[model samples]
Every structure is written in C-alpha cells, then in structure tokens.
Target chain A: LNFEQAIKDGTIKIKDLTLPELIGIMDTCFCCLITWLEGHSLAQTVFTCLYIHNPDFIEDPAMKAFALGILKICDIAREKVNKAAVFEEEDFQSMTYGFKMANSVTDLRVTGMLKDVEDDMQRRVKSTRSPEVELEHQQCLAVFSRVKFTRVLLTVLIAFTKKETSAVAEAQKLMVQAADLLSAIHNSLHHGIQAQIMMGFEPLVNQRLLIIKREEMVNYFARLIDRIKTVCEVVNLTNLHCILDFFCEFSEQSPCVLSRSLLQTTFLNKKVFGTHLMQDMVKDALRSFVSPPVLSPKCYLYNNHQAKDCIDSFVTHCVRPFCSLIQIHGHNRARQRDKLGHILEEFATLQDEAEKVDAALHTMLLACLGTWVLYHNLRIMIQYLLSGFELELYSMHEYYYIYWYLSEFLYAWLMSTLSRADGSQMAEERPLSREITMSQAYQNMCAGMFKTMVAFDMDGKVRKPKFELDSEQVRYEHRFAPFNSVMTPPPVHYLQFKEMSDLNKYSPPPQSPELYVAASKHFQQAKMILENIPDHEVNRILKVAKPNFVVMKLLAGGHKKESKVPPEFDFSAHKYFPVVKLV
Target chain B: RTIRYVRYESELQMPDIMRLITKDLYSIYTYRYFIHNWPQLCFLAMVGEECVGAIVCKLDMFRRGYIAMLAVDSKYRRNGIGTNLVKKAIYAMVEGDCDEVVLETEITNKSALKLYENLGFVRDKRLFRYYLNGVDALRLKLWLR
Candidate 1:
C-alpha cells in the first residue's frame, strides 16, 4: 500500500556492504526464488528485492551480476510457463508488473559476471589476515558458493532450452554440480545477516505479503532434475503407448507447473519432440491400436488420389485430439477429467469422420478407422469415469452406480474393443493385450467394489440420505451425462443401470453375505490377473486389488459389524481403485 | 450467547460482510459484485450487534450456485456459526432452483472441509495454488438435482 516507501532508488551502491550483508541479501533472494516458483507473483516475491529492480545501476559488479542472473532465470521460467499454457492463474503467476528483466543481457555475460565474483570470493577466503579468520573465511565461502550456484543453475536452466541430446547430458551434469553447491549454501546460511550498513538489498521486502530448509530444497531441485531427465528419455521413445505411459506416470507425481509446462512444450506440438510428424504419429497409433487394412502395403488407398486425400484429411483430423489425449494427462487431475469430457465430444465427431472415411476407402469391411476411433473413445470414457474416484467426486451412494458403470459398461466395452483389435496381431506382438489385461483387472476390481458396496447398503452399514431434492436416477443421469452422445457404446440409461443392478430377480433375493462372497471372488480374480503384469505402473493395481481381496474375504466369512458406521475408501494405494477400510 | 441468521437487506450490510470476509483480502468491488448482483443469496450470522459469520454466493445461468466468499470471526468459530451460514445460503440457492452448489476452500482448512463434507458436498477437484497466500484449494460440490 505504501508504494513510495517500497520503491528503491536505482543509484544505490552495494560496494560498501560487508561479506555478511551481501551473503544475507543473496540468501534472501534464494528464499524469494523458491517463493516465486511456489506460485507467488514476481512483484510480490523476487522483484521485491531492490537490487534486481535496477541491476544496471548498481555499482557492485558481483551484486549486479547476481541480480541479472536472477532476472534471467525469471524470464526463462515465465516464458516456459507461458509457452506451455497448461497452467491456470492459480498454478502460476506470470505477470512481471512492468519490471525490466534485462532481456538484452546474454546468459553468457551474466554467467561470466557471476564467475568473476566467484573467483574474487575464493581469493578472499584463501587470504586470511586477522584473528577472526575462521568467521570471515566462512562468510567468503558462503558468498562464493552462492555466486557459483547462481552461475551453474542459470547455465543448467538455459541448457534445458536446447533440444540436442548432448545439451540434455550437459544439463544433467550441471544440475549435479548445482545440487552440491546448494548444501554448502545451506550450511553457511547462519553466517549472514541483513546488516544496517547496506541499502542495496531489501531482505524484508516481501514480509508484508507472505524455508530454505536444506533437505526440503534439495528434494525440490532433485525432483525437478529427475523430471527433466525423464522428459529427455521420453523424447527418445518411439512407441505411442509408452510415451503416453510416461505422461501418466509423470503426472501422477503431481509435477510442478514448470515441469508440466516443459513436458508439454517439448512433446505436445505439430512435431512431437521435434522429430515425429503428427501424421506419422497418428498413423503409427492406428497401426498399433487397430491394424487397418487400408494401411497395409498392398492397399491402394494411398496409391489412389481420392482415397489418399480422404485418408490424409482423416489423419490430420486425428492429430489434434490424439495429441490432446497425451496433453490432457499433463494437466492437474481435476482439469484432466474436465478436459477428457471435452475430448470425448471431439472423439465423437472424429468417430463419425472415421466411419465416413472407412466407407470411402472400400478396403475391407473391418471398419478399421472407425474401430481405431472407438478404441480411443472407450479408453477416454473409462478414464473419465475412473477419474471421479481419483478426484473424490462421488459420494457414498453415488459410488454404487459409478463402480457399476465401470464394471458393467465402460470396462466391458473397452475389453471387447481391445479384443477386436487383438484379432489382427500375434499374442506376443499384440499391442492391445496389455491394455486388455489391465482393463480386465480394473473391471474385476470395480465389480468387487460394486458388490461390496451393495452388500454394505443392504446390511444397513451405509447411511441413507435424510433429504432428497433429486432422485437417484437424476444423479445417475448427471454423472454419466458426458457419454450420452457416443454412438458405438451407446450410452446406458438409468433404467438399464437400475434393472441390471437389481438383485430381486430371484424369489429368494441374494443377502449381504451372499453378495460379499461374489465380491470376494471378483477381487481374487483381479489380483490373479494383475499378478502376471510385468509393467511397474500397471502392477500398482495389485496394490489396490490385493488389499481389497483381503477385506472382501474377511467380510464374506460372516464378519460382524462391530461399528455401525460404514467403511471409508482410502485411495492412497491407487488413484482409481480405493482400498476399502472398515471401521 | 444468542446468534441469529439474516439475509442481506441492502448496502447497509456490506460493511459488516466485508469486515468478516476481508481476510481473503478481497477488494471492495469484489464484495459489491457478488452482493449487489445476488443480495438475497448473501447471509449473515450475528451475535446481537456483531456480525460473526457471512456467506456471499451467486447462481449462474447454468443453475450452478457458487459460494464466492465465506468467513467467520475467529473468536466465534467452532460453534457451528460457519456451518449455519453456509446452510442458510445454500437453502436460499435451492429456493432459486439451483442445480448444484460449489465452493473452494484452502486445502489445509480441515475444519471448513469437514463442515462441507458433512453436508454431502464431495471434493470435486483441487486447484493448485488457488489462494493469494499460495495454498492449494479443494473444490467441493453438492449436487442438488
């Protein structure tokens, strides 16, 4: 609120500051750097430091260079987040608030300035002249470490902008060096102070608006380095599914905005990883997911101008949503679900296009293009439903229908779609085989949860709502509303779901113990099937299925309800399948 | 010892509502925007002459009710004041035929989350760094229809 007091004059000099004073300013800047990365505005965090406000006017070379390096890192970080465009206002604050970032200053120049300061500090540390030699030595070492870290970290960040393989390797090496200096910086933090002798730095600048903990900060950088490394590895992956799996696993860690943006900027574009053409990628995806006859060597679809034109247009149409499928996974879990819903709408239109194109090709009656679209449609539909569990979007009563939909409809549809594709490939070479097995395992898990939930409700363990402005049918319709327009797996209405889940068909209706027995078998089947999965990510399903199997078995063995309260579903094991914890 | 719930009557209540909700550091215009557009949806809980709790909300064209701001005086918390204010606001929205009600609270605000969860609101999604203070938010929703 006090702008006049907050603004600093540009003519201030840092040359008169003591070693402790400069160290304190640098330490505070590091804190502000972390704070800015944590989503605070640049104006509130990093820009609050007066030295960075007008680094060109500062008389001290080391301090001015350090400020310039900070400005450059912020500029790079802002551009990355902006280019990625995956973040909302809450995930990041990209506003510079009209501050000059010294954009014309080359990174090499900044690094050179920092290196000169580092050399000077090292000389000061070695030339001990007084009884307070040890104390001054630590101060000089602290400044040197901070200066060296700024230079190396700036280089590492700039290296990430390069796409060459060697650049990635060099960045990884520089990251290790930066991480080593970080420990020394943390160790000497106590030797610095915001001395009254210097006016060049504003250490308490952002105090009105808002740790530098050693292990925590180290772990933070370590995660970022690991993610950047993983992105490099993923760039070399040629398979579509493997790349998608990387996106899934990487996003599951809830990666920072910068990393998420970097992943997007690097991979999701007209040219994936700057190598694979979008058309080529889509064609490969179709070949892997559903080997259509039109893509065969003997097919005339590509040779004929009319057929090739039609196929080319279809492939171009596929590029956006196909890249979107991978891009959606890079978003936060909630946005992923929302985007998937919109993606299904696009897929619905793509399905129509694929059908028309398949008919035009006249290659075979397999409806290859349509089948490819259907395969992706089914996967997106399943993801949209299961994401509800991950986001905890469903209530206890709603969980019954949510699980029932997955087990009875979406997964069943997915398995059949995968099976249709399996007919075209060998057992070992079947691209859909892993997906089929994983879907089957997930299907059984959902079935197990569905039946267990029904039994819990039947046994009066689940609480009934006291008031209802809407019927259960209305809730079901609202939940599955997104799937209504899909043609292939025609949306299942409320009546169908209700009729299918109804247990009163027999004169003697199945009881709680009977349902639990059925549920237990489903869990056992899921675990048995998932046990053979060699993929580490897919194997996590067993973590969910195995524990639920134990609980279901115990319930099936006439377990009493010692507590009247219903059970809680813990998703700590896996995002999709929750391990039911009984009270 | 006595507390009462009242709907917003006019600009007279703006100061009291803003006083209660200003911890979010909302500008005067933000309060004016919500309260002026849907004054009936705003409710206040009072302990005699003092405003203890307030909820400002709006129902959009999609029939979705949004709780734009909610706050209770720290001295009067843990006595069901915030819960009653939310219930009152939601009841008014339901009367307006709202299809669903949604709001976001800081992820670390366990007590506020528990209050909403108890009212059948499910955690819909998490918005990263949703607050000005850099705390993530858990978006909660209660389906009315």
Candidate 2:
C-alpha cells in the first residue's frame, strides 16, 4: 500500500508547510469536490487528500480545521443529493465507501474555525508591506478568499436545506457574497503554487476518473439558485393549470437533479407548496378543467352521503397521480418519458374508478370525475408522444407517424375536452382559454409538419432504408403500443392512420404541390393563432411558427423547378417543433 | 491509401489499438476492460502496417450494444475510416442481436454528430458537464428493433 509515501507522519507537520503549499492543497481539494460532484466516487476524488485521513493529528489548527470543514461539506452535499433522489448513476455518486465524514464537528464549529483562520490571514496580509514580501501578501489574500468562500458556501448550502421562505431569501444574499469571493479566488489562482507543492494531496489519484472551470461552476450554482427562487414564486399561482404550466416550463429547462428533486420535495410536501391541501388542489384541477354537477354546492349530489363518499374517495384516489404528474417533471428527460408511460396506467385505473363513481352518483350528464381523469390522461399521452422529439428518441422516418398521431388524434381529443370545460367559471377565469389556444397552436404546428413530410414523401425526397427488416405498419404499431390500453380516446389503429393520411382517398389523388399548399395553410393558421397570444411562453412557439410558415411558402413556390434535395428540420427554433428548412 | 478493417485477434494488437485511442484521453484500464471481454466486437482499421482507427464496443445483458470508444488518427480522418469502424462494430452487435446501439460524444463535436446522424442515429438526451474538461455530452442512440 506504500505506507511510507501515503502516511501523514511527524516528519512533515502541517504547521511547517508553506503558505503557497496550503493554498495549493485547498485549491486542489476544491477541484476534488467539483470532480466528486461530477459523478466520481468520493474515495477517488475528495478522499485522495491524505490529511483528510487523519485530521486530528495535524498540529496546525488552520489546516486541521480546513480538512475537517471539507469533510463536513462533503457529508452535507452527499446527504442533500441522496435525499433528493433524482440522480441516476450517471448524474451523481452518493456512496461514502466506508470513510467517516467527521460528523463529530458541527457546521457552526467549522465556520468558526474558518473565520479564525480568515482573521489570521487578514492580519498576515496587513503585516506584509515591503516589496520583498509583496508575493506573501498576495498568497495570504488568496488563502483568505478561499477560506471565506468555503465558509459562505457551506452556509449557503445549509440555508438551502431549510424550508422557511426567509432561509431562501437569506441564501440568495449569501450566494452573491460567495460568488464575489469566488471571483477573487479565481483571479488569484496564480498565487497558489500547485506543481511544486506536495502538501498531502494526490492530484493524480483519480487519473482514471472522468475544472469542471470556476466560471462554469458559478453558472451552475446560479442556475440552481434561480430554480429554487422560481419554485418559491409558485406560492403566488392559485390556478392549477397555471401551476402545472409552471412545472412544465421549469422541466423544459432541464434543471439540475438537485433542483428538480428539491422542487418535487417542496411542492409535494404534505400540502402543495406547503399551504394548499392535496384534495383541494385536486378539486381545483377538476373544477378548472371540467366543471361537473357533482362538485356544485347547490346540487343534491354534493349533499348526499353516498355521493359525497364516492366523490371524496375519487378525489383522494386522484391525489397520487395528480402529484405524480407534477413530480414527473423532476426526473431526467429519458426517465421522465418512462415515468410518463407508467403514470398513464395509474390514470387509466383512476378513469375506471371515476366512471363507477359517476354511475353511482347518477351524474352521467357530466361524468365530471371521469372527464377530469380523461382530461389529464390525454395531457399525459400528448406529452409522452411529444417528449420523444425533445429527447431525440424519434428518427426522421418516424417523424411523419409521430406528427400524424399528434395532429390527427391527440390534439383534436385535447381540444374537444378543453371545449367541454369552456362554459365553466374556470374557463372564464382565463386558465382554460390559455390552454385551449396553446393546444390549438401546437396542433396546427404538428399538422403542418405532417403535411410537409407527406409532400416530401410523395416527391421521393424521403430516403428509404437500404435493407428492409420490418414493415412500416409494424413499426407504427410498436411506437404507439403504450396507447393500446387506453380506452376513452381509444387506440388509433395503423389502418386508421393510413386511411386518414392516405393520398388515394382524395378524389384526384392529391399531388406534392397540393400537399405543400395544404401544409403552408396549416403553418399560416399556427402563425395567426400564436400572434394573437400575449403569453410570454407563446413567444417560444411563435419563434418556430414564423419560420415554419415562411419555409412552407418557399417550398410551395419552388416545388416545380427546385433541386430534389431533402430539407432539414432545425430544432433550434423550439424543442418540440423543428423548423423545416430547405437545403 | 487503402485501409482494411479487422477484428481483434489477440493481445498482440492491443499496443497498436491503444496507440490510436490514447489520443482521446482514456486510461489503460478502460481499454483493457472493454477489449478483453468483447475482443471480437473490437475492431481496428489498419493501413499496411500502421493502425489508424479503432472502435471498442460491448453488448450488455439487456441486448443493448455500447460503443465505448471510437478514435481515428487525425491525419486519417475525413476518409470515412471512423464511419467504417462504427459500421463494422454495429454489424457485429447486430449479429449478436443487439436491440439498440448507444454512445455519447461532446456536444461541440459537429463532425461526430453528423457522422452518427447520417448513419440513422438520433440524439437521445443531453448530459450536463459529462466530461472532465467541462463539456456537455449528447447521447446518441440507434434503435434496431
């Protein structure tokens, strides 16, 4: 094991180490922590420092305190990431691998130790005034900045763990302070000697493992703080649809795993946002999406014991899937798609239960609970299908089928359901209208893409696989297999897609030019709808819609004399809808 | 110059393959772990006596094929050597009945992205700070079934 080289013996006491050497050790330890956070095991990264192995034996109080502080920071970080549970093996490594995290020392004590060292360094900087000692002054200042940064960052992390709103506000201030110190630390990095110092650190110990730069780390922390701040802002949103929109928008940014988990833990806490009851939130969602008579205070069904029991049980049953729908956004993009698939089964069961409740209540006129379940189920189905594009799960050949499914089935079903809820108080309140307009815009976008691809296929611009293993019909069935169990909207069989989208069904068998004309009209319709919306979120959609409309017009005009090259779909416009650009 | 592709036959070829791939910054253990277990899936592109390109791969228990590493000598790039190496690896995994093939590359590597995309691979997801040098990775996947 090479104990001679690895052991921390008395021959090299911490007190005897040079200031530059200590700075190097501290700087390298920070790098190690960054590496550990990047998914490497703690043993391979942070534990590579020999001093951390025996902090109690160090004679220098500053070095000992710093080593102990590092352990505490590691322990807190591991605990937080572990508690969040949003990380996969590729995202983070939470195992300690038998190493003690110096739990005996409290966070307060570590900060005090850091403050003491910081004071001593400040004094040293004040004493060094001669030109001969100018270099020492810079080194002292560098060390002081690092110590202050570590202490502030440790407090910032602890503050984030608190649930109180004030703690979050305090964390924001401390984060800014830590960021200022970080810049000082980054600027004075040259003052710290790394290559010539061997101060108990094995920089190459984890050579086999995968700066992660100081500036990039700053950006990362900034994003995390902003996400938590955004979550805090959710307290102001009273509408379930608006809150769901916030969740969806937050998820679309693909927040870090910690922030995602924090969002889930915070919002899903016994009460939504720690204030609203789960059942109340569910009731609001139903009242907002589909206002059925069963929920009306004036209805006999609302006062009847049997009806009340059924409705309450149905609402209670709904809380899990409803909360899960929001929580699903906290997972990685790939895992989110998988979770969406599983949650649909839950919704399917809920729908069945909902129907029984409606039948027992004799509320078949509205089927409010059933309709609510169906509304959410439809939303989940659409997200599941569309997420494939954002995640890059679909090939170009499969795009036509995905877009066709969205255009011909899912969006139409969603709009019809939204329309059914149109006369309710919730609809008049602006939630339903925003949802309806957005859904229509998305529908028109999908329709335009599908028609454009159809035109490309007819013109022989779509490339065919050299070797045919499976028929296109089988692939279509396999792609939409998850929808087979769904009953309300019913499964859209391959034959139906073929029948609806088939060209031969037309009286004269529409040609590529006619298809492009229809496609251009769809894009134009999408642009018109998006332009009328004032929502900021619609701006992302409008960006894609304008380019799509222009491209469709270009293709329709040039179809007769243009080269036969296939066009490229640029996703830079939006994650879900790619602008079709002619090559 | 004509380059021929061949499957790993023995440890004798390890040195040449290592020489070509070490430029991509891999540890010896990583090379040995993949090559030793699935030597047949590993392929090397050679021009006469010099090795210019290599691909290391394996198929997991779930019938998932993984292309762990792919590298072509800088001078030998743009000659379709990287494409052919990947094609050979995919063909081998196909023979072994892999359900899908997956790998990750730096998001900034446009050439690698285009090479995989042209071969029908799609971007599955983006991983943040997946490399030691602080670059994001784009996971690419090709579904065979």
Candidate 3:
C-alpha cells in the first residue's frame, strides 16, 4: 500500500532474485496487466504505481519485458482515447489521466533514448560469449522486437477496426521486419522459450494479410511461412496449437473476398504430409485404417489388406462428405458453392419444409467445418510426431511414453467430436449425409479402437518397468532393447470385449511404444495438473523446475494397500525406452 | 432405499445439492464454487424427491480430472448407492473427454478405499497432513487411455 517506497525499494530489489522468483513475479504482474486491460479500473490504478518510467533504460531484462508490455498497453489506450473525439467510456478518461500522470516528469528531452541504450548494450554483448549469455542477449533483443511488433499490430488492428485500410501498408512492412527479427531471436533461444513467444502474432498477421492485397504482402507471407516451418522443425509446441486454432477458424471461413495465396501457402503442405518421414505417419497413426490386426504370433499386431481398405473407407467417408463441399478449388469455387447450394435448394423443395431445409443446411455446414478442421488436426498430430522421428528430436527410450500419448490424444479427439455430434442428433434421428453417418461410425470405431487396444493389458494393472512385474518383461523384451525397425504395430486382438474373468485368458500385449510417444509428448505438458502436489521440499524444487507440474499419483493399500510408482512417467517402461520431455 | 440416479442438472438441482453437501459438514463456499462453475462435473442420486447422494468433480482442461467430493446420506449407506454414484460420475467424465480421473481420500477410510479400488482406481501419491484435521490422504487415479 505504501506505493512510492514500494517502487523505490521493493520493486528495485526484484532484480537480485532468482529465475523462479523472477518468473513468478513476471507472471503475477502480467496477469495484473491483463486484468487492467479488460476494464478493471482498480487493476490499472495499481499498475500505475509500478510503471517505473524506464527513462534511463536500466531495468532487468526479465522485469523490462513485462514492463514494456504494460507500458505499450497504457500508451495504446491513451492514443485510442485521444483519437476518438467523444469519450463514451469513463475508463477511457481515467486511463488517459493515469497515462499523463506517468509521463508528467518529462525531464529527459532525448529522443529514442530507450532504443539507443538497447543498441549499446546489445553491441556490448555481441562479441563472442558463452551460449548462455548469447541466449540471454538474443531473448532481450526478441523481447524488444516483440514489444514494437505488438505496437504495430495494435495500430494495424485499430486501423482495420476503424475502417482505415490505406495506413496498413507501413504496418505490413513493420510486421514482416518483426517476423525476420524474431526468427534471428528465435534461433538463439532454446526450444521451449521460442515456442512461448512465437504465437499470438500469427493470427493477427494472417488477418492483416487476408485484407491487404499486394504482391509484396504475398512475398512477405511466403517468407514468414518458411521461417515458421524451419522453427517448427525444432520444439515448437504453442505455435502448433496457435496454427491449429487458426486453421479451425480458417475452416469456417467463406471463400468470399478470400486472398488467393494466403490459404494456399506452403504451410498447408507442411501441415499435411510434408516430410519424408510423414510418408506413412498418418495411416501409421490411424490404427483403424487396418482391419482387425492380422492374427499372428509375430509378438506384435500387424495390418492386413482388408483392414487397409476399411481404413481408407473410414477416412474417405469422414473427409469427403463435407470436404467435397470445400474442394471447389481455383476458378471453380463459386461453381462449387452453387453446386452445394443447389443440392440444398432441391432438398428444401422436395421436402417442402423450410425448417427441414434449415436443419439440413445447419448440420451440413457444421459437418463441413468440423471435418475440414479436424482433418487438419489429425494431419498436424501425425506431422508433429513424424517430425520428431525424422529429426530424432527425442530419445528412443521415450517410444512407449509418446506412443501411449498418441492413443490418449486420439481418444480425446474422437470423444470431443462425437460429443459434438450428440448435440446435433436432437435435430434428426437418422444419418442425413456422409458427414453425419461417418462421424457416428468414427465414434463407434474410436470406442472399439480404445477397447481393442487396451483389452490385453493386465486387468487394471500398470505396466511394470523392466525391473519389476509379472514376466511382463518376458513378453516385452523387444521394447527393452533397440529394435532395427521403426515399424508400427497394429491393434492387438482380444477376441471380443470381455472382462478379465475365467473364460478370457491370453498373453497380454507388451503394448506398442511407437504409436503412443508422439501424441503423448504433445499432450503431456499441455494437460498439466497444477496445485495438487503437497508442499514438501522435493515438490517445491520440482515445482520450480516444471512450473505446471503434472504428478500421476497412486494409492497403495495400507492394511493391504501398496502404492507403487507407475512406470509410465519414467523415460520408457519395460526396457531402456528413450526419455523425452516434450515441453 | 429406492434411489434413481439422475444427471446433475445444474439449475434445478443445485439448491438440493447445496443442502445435502452443507449437511455433510463441507464448507459452504466449496459447494458454491462447484455447483456454480462446474455443475456439469456432478451427478445427483435422488430418492423420490429428496437428494440422497452425489458425486462432484472438476477437470483441469487437459487430461486430469478430480473427484472433489462424494457424499451419501448415512441412511442409504448399506447399499452400493455410493458405488453407483461414483460410476455415474466416472462415465460422464470419460465421455466428457477426460483422459484420467483422480481424487484424494483419507487413508483411514476403509470403505471409501474399497469402493474406488474395486472400480480400478490406483494409489498415486501419499499426502501427509493433507486435511485441515491433520489426516493423511491418498491420491488415486484411473487413466482412461
């Protein structure tokens, strides 16, 4: 509450804190700024106290990064207030008042003092230094570039919102420069940090590119995609998610006034089977593509020709129903739209029911968007996993972990899509089109897929590590050693769905490590369970390391209960499966 | 006791849920948070008109789901009423797109331990002084994948 002394002493002392404390405070302060930006007057008033004018530009890089974000927010709010003659919102006037109060000192008349100090410090560290120092210097440079890029993005956004299109040209050039600068910055930092800062801009960039029509803009976009693909070849987690979200929106986009080159970018190809490793990753991941696994004693499941046909039919049914509506490519797009629309018109007239026609169109439109976007997600998951294989980004010991995660991801995806279908079933009882029927079939197959795969695992028993368990080691010797083939195993046959009882007895599967590790690595850090770990010293250190730590706990019987550490969290279970931490 | 298992319909049954939870000596604010924000994660066990039991849960937007509370009226305790309630909640969770479901329980609760373990829950972590009462609690999880 002692605002003045707080900045003079307390805030200044944060520079000496460790990285954990620094990150914690930065997150807290950034959260506060987010709250302030969203019409929280008191939050803004509180931040006004901590907005130390970096006039001399001597703040800690960590502190300065968040401070710069806050300052840009304040300056932009003030600019918007100044531009609009009539202040409709009281917060606008209050924000302007606070902004003026912050700049009231006005003593330093030097122009571009912050930029000059940054350049000087940057050059000082530019001379060959340790990788750690080099990384720090590059992160600092990226933070500066990002802060400026945010300024330009907001300016461009406001221009678009205000219906002033011409001024976006300068903003577009700055956008491209920001992309290039960040790529250099991105190359310097390690993988995780690169992913965190890489996103939340592409959406804005894509939006602007969609509007501004020019040959140079097209070139800039091409260069941006090339940079993104290069960076994604490394650990690019959040960027992948951002791109997925963008693609989902793009799926819903009408072709009206669409830019020719934006959607047709090289990134789309990269999204699908771009790399040579991806040659089989999709059908590889799509276990259902193969019919019931060939009944073989090869110690692993194998796909036969019949199941391959079934898999092909499943994908075609799922994709083509609505995607056929979307594939009206090139000059024939309008023809495609009319072609689909004409079908709807005929259905409406045939039924002589307005409500019926509306419902069909609604289901078809939902199906179109849902399948198109989901197809991309499937491809994205495959490509991301295959990229790891192509690059050997993860250790081989991690095969099982990634493989199981792939299963979980597929389960989650199908569960969500099916639930979406359930909501629509209220409209009509029967399958209306290919989208509806295949989606239903897909969900059924998913449940079947989940059951068949998990059926052979020892009933309710976690797979024991090579050191432990019921001769589980005897069956899974292949996993404990490095195998010559990267061959994916098919789903194990369990006859039919049955409980672990007297009648059903067979050797449980060692479980395929290949199909799982890829998707699991993607979802691991993502589904982090925060705030559960007990406040012990071990957990305290672990928290600092993982931040969003996900602890998989088990309850062993006390009178009889024995809580054992599950092998799933370790590198790879069974044998020397490679260890991979995807985050 | 003839109890009909019904899905947790947030708006209609939240008041009864609050009544049942508060009677079991839970914090009023905790019930308020769950019934309001995470209404979908709960299932109510109804006996005619009165609410006899319920299971409440919350998902962490990824794979982890928590069964925060499960309580049944003592009069209905002799039957497998609590088991049915728990199963209902787990089914909803798995279908609701959870990869795993977990919960914390006092290590001393013999019957509670039996109910969950029989249904495939495994002990995950041990928590010392986990409750305000200074009781040790066991964390249990069931992975759907």
**Highest lDDT scorer:** 1
Pick the DockQ winner.
1
lDDT of 2 by residue, B28-66 (tens): 888888887898899998899888888889888858899
Q: A445-562 in candidate 2: lDDT tens per residue? A: 8998998888888787776444333356655766787897778889988888888878887789988778888988988898899887675568888998887787778767865434
Question: Lowest-scoring 10 consecutive residues by lDDT in candidate 2 chain A?
Answer: A1-10
Clashing pairs in 1: none
For B4-79, candidate 3 gives per-residue lDDT tens digits of: 9887664677678777776773666787787677777788888988988988888877577899888888888858
CAPRI accuracy category, model 1:
acceptable
Residue pairs in steric clash, candidate 2?
Answer: none
- Error (Å) of candidate 2 at residue A330 is 1.4
Greater TM-score among 1 and 3 belongs to 1
Residue B51 deviation, candidate 2, in Å? 14
Residue A493 Cα positional deviation in candidate 3, in Å, after optimal superposition: 13
TM-score of 1: 0.86
TM-score of chain A for candidate 1? 0.90
lDDT of 1 by residue, A202-289 (tens): 4455555543543365456656766666665666678776777778888878888888887787775467766678798878877776
List DockQ for all candidates.
Answer: 0.40, 0.18, 0.05
List residue ranges in candidate 2 displaced over 4 A. Answer: A1-13, A16-23, A58-65, A114-144, A163-166, A176-182, A195-198, A204-211, A231-243, A269-276, A363-365, A426-429, A534-536, A559-562, B1-145
